[PDB]
Amino acid sequence: SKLEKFTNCYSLSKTLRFKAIPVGKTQENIDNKRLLVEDEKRAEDYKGVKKLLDRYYLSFINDVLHSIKLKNLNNYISLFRKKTRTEKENKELENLEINLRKEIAKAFKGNEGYKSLFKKDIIETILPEFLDDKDEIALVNSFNGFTTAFTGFFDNRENMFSEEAKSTSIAFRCINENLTRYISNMDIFEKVDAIFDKHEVQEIKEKILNSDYDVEDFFEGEFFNFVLTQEGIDVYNAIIGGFVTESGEKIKGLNEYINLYNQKTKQKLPKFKPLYKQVLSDRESLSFYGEGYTSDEEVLEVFRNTLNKNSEIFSSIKKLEKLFKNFDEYSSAGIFVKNGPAISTISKDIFGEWNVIRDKWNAEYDDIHVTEKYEDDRRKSFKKIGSFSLEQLQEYADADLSVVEKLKEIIIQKVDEIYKVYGSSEKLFDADFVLEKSLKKNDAVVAIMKDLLDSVKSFENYIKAFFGEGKETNRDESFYGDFVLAYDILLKVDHIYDAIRNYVTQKPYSKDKFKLYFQNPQFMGGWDKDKETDYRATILRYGSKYYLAIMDKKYAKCLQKIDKDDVNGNYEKINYKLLPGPNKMLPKVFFSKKWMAYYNPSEDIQKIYKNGTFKKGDMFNLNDCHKLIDFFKDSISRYPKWSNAYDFNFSETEKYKDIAGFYREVEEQGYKVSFESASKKEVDKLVEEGKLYMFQIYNKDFSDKSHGTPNLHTMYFKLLFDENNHGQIRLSGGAELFMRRASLKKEELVVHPANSPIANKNPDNPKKTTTLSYDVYKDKRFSEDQYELHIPIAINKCPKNIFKINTEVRVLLKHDDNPYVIGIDRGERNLLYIVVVDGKGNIVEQYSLNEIINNFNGIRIKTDYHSLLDKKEKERFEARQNWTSIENIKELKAGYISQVVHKICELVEKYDAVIALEDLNSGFKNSRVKVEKQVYQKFEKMLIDKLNYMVDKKSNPCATGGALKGYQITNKFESFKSMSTQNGFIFYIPAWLTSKIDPSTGFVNLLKTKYTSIADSKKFISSFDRIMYVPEEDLFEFALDYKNFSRTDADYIKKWKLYSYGNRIRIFWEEVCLTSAYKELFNKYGINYQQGDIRALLCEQSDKAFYSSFMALMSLMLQMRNSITGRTDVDFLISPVKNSDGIFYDSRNYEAQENAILPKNADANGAYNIARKVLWAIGQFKKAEDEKLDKVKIAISNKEWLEYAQTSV
RNA sequence: AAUUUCUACUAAGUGUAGAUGGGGUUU
RNA sequence: AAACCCC
Structure with a gap:
């Protein structure tokens, strides 16, 4: 089989989550010694300490950049394309590049204290001194020793930026953003000073710093001369726009002063731009994240209650649309509409049909430049067009349509619709509104919220396109000045929407946990026996029960003293040994100056370790290779920590071609899992005293009332400590224990009382009604406190069959005489349809995956998920498409996709088949009652992910496709857009002409029979x-x-x-x-x-x-x-x-x-032809030589498809 | 209507079938 | 605020 060669290909890692149940008096002792109270407190203060850490970061920034008056590159930078230099921006563009780079570099070098900013020292000392509030310092001091919590925060508060571009950078913000709005600073503001009189300038200087001489370089053109970095971003803005001092009178800065010319005397010079504030803090912080939503009264409608500014900008954009007629006078061409999906919508709105604009553009392409290839290039160019001017659309107006004025009608209609739901939402807005049945049961109130939110969101989404691609030349600033202002405030509604939606659509419980450290900052950091007094955590095992023993701070050596009880019971403690990365471990510890004694290496070999000799380049040769190998080999023999721990059976040095062949052995053999015994009685006494804290590692498959197939994560775990596991699954370090507390009350859970009949809900279940001798509650797990053990594992850490998967598949498919392909297509009456064809295109199997048949015991019970979806879609019609119904639909769909992943995996194994799926980055599908693009993209991701290690839970774990020898037939998921050709066994093909084609002739209707004239x-x-x-x-x-x-x-x-x-x-x-x-x-x-x-x-x-x-x-x-x-x-x-x-x-x-030989329905035709497009590709491989199989284009064109279709039959 | 968790369940009576990388970090 | 780090 071709699947068999795809084992041990690459490494992957997973985290298996479990439940830890406190054994014995563990919980009593944990509670008596208050061991979770400081962990919980820390987790509650985490966010607050981060706020204070950011206060220091802000002060650092405003003391470094507030001294940086470098401008060493240039305090002028008067090479700003005023008179385009060097051969029309040839080397002038390179001079502009270097300028930018070097200025940002200056502003960015490790500043005045970059060391104690993102390390332990800030929480330890710097922050406590800086802060002057006892309680704030207390929060900071509660995190002493536990500053590893802030690692990712540290790597984003510094390491999101460096010496680069990106909004994250503070120098980008200061140079490549703020100096752009400060480049407009030397050309004509003094010519616009007709309105800005002497008394005005002096008035505003007496209002701002009188020390600031005047208004200086301000808002004109050409170059810069004063700010560069941050010379008072707010001071600049105070007089660019306007500020209020203590007077109360809004001191017009200069923007309102420009409006005197623009209104009192009606002139058309526009307004100016305010300096982008350093992203809230300087690079990060959060403005409209506005959280707190935990009750039914938080957020209180930020659409007209908390934010009347959203309502204020509806009126702002309303004004802009009535002003569209005068924007005609000042650049109607300047108004651009972003080319994209909105262009088709705007065509339908302005003209009549969706294709009007597209046709009018293609017609111009048809004037200058109808073949298949021709149309490809046409669309390519249309997609490249970033935006369409309004005048361009007035030219593309088929007849007497005034695009600009037609648009005006559309937008006024939209704003009036928002106002219609504003009338319907007055009760919700009233301060004296009463929430009757919550906000998770008051579907009338939920509807009011949803409807208004949708009206606002729709207006915002439609108006979005009226910006254009962003970087146009002619852009009426009298439109695109106030538009951008209002639209930025409108964009906030996407947050409010999501927040209110998420509160309503939430699960009734919480999954919020907190990390437990057991007063040990190095808790469970590994499983090394050598550091069992530092990690203070080990995995014990009694029979089939697995445990997590945690030593106490005072009694860390307690389990190291316990010995076996020959006659009595015995817990088995794990002896975990792992050499972590021989490629780095060995060199580091053996070339070291500490090791410059036992097996001292000379400085020549230290330079081999330094320069790059042993690593790569043309310096790596057998001299260093074999010498280093032997030195390492014998210094491992001189290292009792690595020699006694792992008996490193090696081979001859001559055999080792490179140092990596040697290192492979040190990784494969440098891992051991053993189990030494300990008296169960003594271990239990330690638990009683409080010296040890035992927890049972548990999932429902560890119950004694459990009888079927275990979850695969349970098998993975149980095989970590198995004898046939030889390193295929290793226990990586980095385990974490968390504590999710209760969120629900047991008395308020829905019970199905004991000895009372309970209706069975599967219509295809022969049994209706169940009757149990016990009570069954809804969400019992969230009514009690739970400990969550998250355990990282490493599958195939020492890969042995390393090859390129994509190429190997192509080679194997080119040499398979009967290659099977599973075509999968999403249909209209079927959720998904599967057609398996062989090498010649003969349907071997065709069926819908509407129903999923589960196989427990010997019984097979079918579940039609299509009927389930139909029921839920009727429940979406009733209750006007409410948020909950659509989330239920999406969750059902995601769960169905999980079952289908299993079905497809089985078909791959049954037929040794390649899969054929739809490239979702190309054409579209209709309103197929089925997987939509979003859910089908998740399906394909989940399919790739499963085939990165495809395992059958019901096979012998040591057999191919078993838990320890799974199939890696795809490569790791990168992006949804990277799913476009082959991922391994998955071939993504375009689905044009796959459904509406005749399976027996190949006929497709290429005629346009729509009556025209x-x-x-x-x-x-x-x-x-x-x-x-x-x-x-x-x-x-x-x-x-x-x-x-x-x-x-x-x-x-x-x-x-x-x-x-x-x-x-x-x-x-x-x-x-x-x-x-x-x-x-x-x-x-x-x-x-x-x-x-x-x-x-x-x-x-x-x-x-x-x-x-x-x-x-x-x-x-x-x-x-x-x-x-x-x-x-x-x-x-x-x-x-x-x-x-x-x-x-x-x-x-x-x-x-x-056993039909041709498709049985239209959905079967889709899947058949999706698989036949891959059969074409297999024939393409079959024609080429094995060296160039990776170059074979597998993309079918409609021409080659129709030839294949019309001539295979 | 039970779950490491999620979906479907009751599936033979405290569970069944599949799937299941976690943790920070971003308005 | 989608992908970005460490596992």
């Missing part, structure tokens, strides 16, 4: 080779050459005679028989259809209605997929063309056949 219909009719009526078979035959029609280059056969066979569902629904209705249209218009070629007679008609109805019957004839929306019984695929044997395909002639 009488003349176009005559052109259509006469473009046919013959439109006659065959009287023998009673079928009108329409012979066609596709070459006589447009955009049909993809077709291979080109010559197809269509026939009016059978019935079509005209969804207007009606089952129209085509022959009959053609006859009827002809008889209605008095056309003798029995007169041979009737093409000319059809063209001799003149009534537009004949043409429209011939066109509609034409459309229907070419409809292969015919399905009634509602009645699910009726759904089929019917061919207009006959095959070689003279038969038209009907899916209805296959749905009954158990």
Whole structure:
């Protein structure tokens, strides 16, 4: 099998979460010695200490950058493209680059105390001194010794930036952002000083710092001369925009002073830009994260209650739209609409149809530049267009449409709709509103919130596109000045939406935990026996029960003293030994100056360890290699800590080609799991006294009332301590114990009382009603306090079969005579459909995954998830698409996807098959009641992730595909966009022409039979080779050459005679028989259809209605997929063309056949053809040589597909 | 309507079938 | 605020 070679390929790591149950008096002692109170306190103060840590970071920044008056690069930088230099910004662009770089570098070098800022010292000493509030210092001192909690905070408060770009940087913020708005500072503000009189300037200087001489370089153009870094970002803004002192009168800075010219005297110089404040703090902090939502009264509607500013900007954008007519006068071309999905929507809104704009653009492309390839380049260029000016759209106006004014109508309609829900939300806003049944049961109140939120959100989303791509040249600043102001405040509603939604859609409990340290900052940091007095945590084992023993601070050596009890019971303590990374461990500790004695290495070998000799380059050769290996080998023999711990059976040095062959042995053999015995009695006495704290590592599969297949994470854990595990699964260090407290009360849980019948909810369960002898509660686990043990593991840490997966698959597929492919397609009447084909394209198996059959004991119980979804979708219609119903739908879908992952994994194993899925980064699907793109993307991610280590829970763990020898047939997930060609066994293919194609002929309708005009219909009719009526078979035959029609280059056969066979569902629904209705249209218009070629007679008609109805019957004839929306019984695929044997395909002639040879339905056709597109790719591999198999393009074009389809049959 | 957790459950009576990397860090 | 570090 080809799957068999994909074992031990690469390393992966997982975290297995468990429950820890306090054994014996552990909990009593933990509670008596108050061992979780300081851990909980720390976890509550974590955020507050981080706030104070940031106070120091702010003060650091405002004492370093508030001294940096460097401008050593230039205090002028007057090379700012005023007169584009060096050969039109050739080396001038490089001079602009170097300037930027060096200025940012200056501002960024390790500043005045960069060491004690992001290390332990800040919490230890710096922060306590800086702070002057006893309680604040107390919080900081409660984190002494436990400053490892702030590691990621430290690596984002410093290490998010460095000497680079990105908004995270403070220098980027100061140079590559703030000097951009300060580059407008030497050209014409003094010419705009007509309004800014002498008395005005002096008035505002007497209001701001009088020490500040004037207003200086301010808001003009060209270069800079005063600020550079931060010279009072707020001071600048105080007079750029406006500030209020203590006077009360809003001291117009200079922006309102410009408005005197713009309003009192009506001029058109615009307003100026305020300096971006250093991101809240300087680089981070949080503004609109506005949290606290835990009660039904927190946040209190930040849409018009807490934030009336959101309502204020509805009026702001309303004004902007009425001002659209005057923005015409000042740059209507300047208003751009971002090209994207919104452009199609805006086309429908302004003109009529969604494609108007696209067609008008393609038409211009068709003036200068209809082949398949041609259209690819057309779209490529359209996508590249970043935005469309409003004037460009007025030119693309088909007729007399004023784009700008039409837009104005649309936006005013939208703002009025917001106001409609504002009228309906007055009660919610009232201060005297009363919450009756919570906010998780008051679906009327929830609806009020949702509806208003949606109205606001929709307006905001529509107005978003009116910005453009961002970097345009002409951009009316009189629009794009106040627009950006208002839209930034509107964008805040996405937060409020999500927050209110998440409170309503929350689970009734909490999953909030806190890390426990047991007064040991190095708690459970590893499992090393040598550091059992530092980690103070070990895994014990009695029988099949596994335990977590934690030594007390005072009694850390307690378990090291306990010996076995030959006669009595015995706990087995783990002896965990691991050499962590020989490639670094050995060099570090053996070349060291400490080790410059026992096996002293010389400075030449120290430079081998330094320069880069032993690592890589052309310096690495056998000299250093073998010498170092032998030195390491023998210094390991001189190291009792590594020699007695692991008997390192090595091979000869000559065999070792590189040092890595040697290091592989030191990793494989440098790991041991053993189990030494300890008297159970003594261990239990330690637990009684409080000297040891034992917990049972537990999941429901560790119950004695548990009988079936264990969870795979339980098997992984149990095999960590197994004898057949030889390092395949290792226990990585880094385990954490947490404590999730109770969130629900036991008395308030929904009980199903004892000895009372409980209805069974699966309709396909032969048993309804259950009756238990005990009570069953809802969410029992969250009504009690739980300890959570999170244990990291390492699968395949020493990979042995290292190859490129993608290439190896291609090579194996090229040499497989019968390669099977599993095509999976999301359908309309099916959630997912699976068609497995073989090497020749013969359907070996076709079935829907609507129902999932679980196999417990020997019984198989089916669960139709499609019916479950239908029920939940009816519950989404009732309760007007509320948040909860859609989350229930999404959770059901995610859970269904988990079951399907298993089903697909089994098919891979059964058929040694490659999977064929849809590239979701290309075309679209309709409203298939099924996985939508989001859930199908999650499915593909989960499928990749499962196939990174594919294991069957019901196989012998030491067999291929068993827990210790799983299949790594895909590569690690990177991105959703990286799922586009091959991931290993998964091939992603485009799904164009896979469903609406005839499986037996390959026929696709490439005709556009939508009625346009009488003349176009005559052109259509006469473009046919013959439109006659065959009287023998009673079928009108329409012979066609596709070459006589447009955009049909993809077709291979080109010559197809269509026939009016059978019935079509005209969804207007009606089952129209085509022959009959053609006859009827002809008889209605008095056309003798029995007169041979009737093409000319059809063209001799003149009534537009004949043409429209011939066109509609034409459309229907070419409809292969015919399905009634509602009645699910009726759904089929019917061919207009006959095959070689003279038969038209009907899916209805296959749905009954158990082993159909052609698709049974339309959803089966999709999956069949998805798998046949990969079969094409396998034939492409088969034609190429093995060295260039990785270069074989697996992307099918519609032309090559249609050739394959039309010529394989 | 029980769960390391999630989804579906009751699935044979305190559970069943699958899946399940955690922890910081970002408005 | 999607992907970003360490496991």
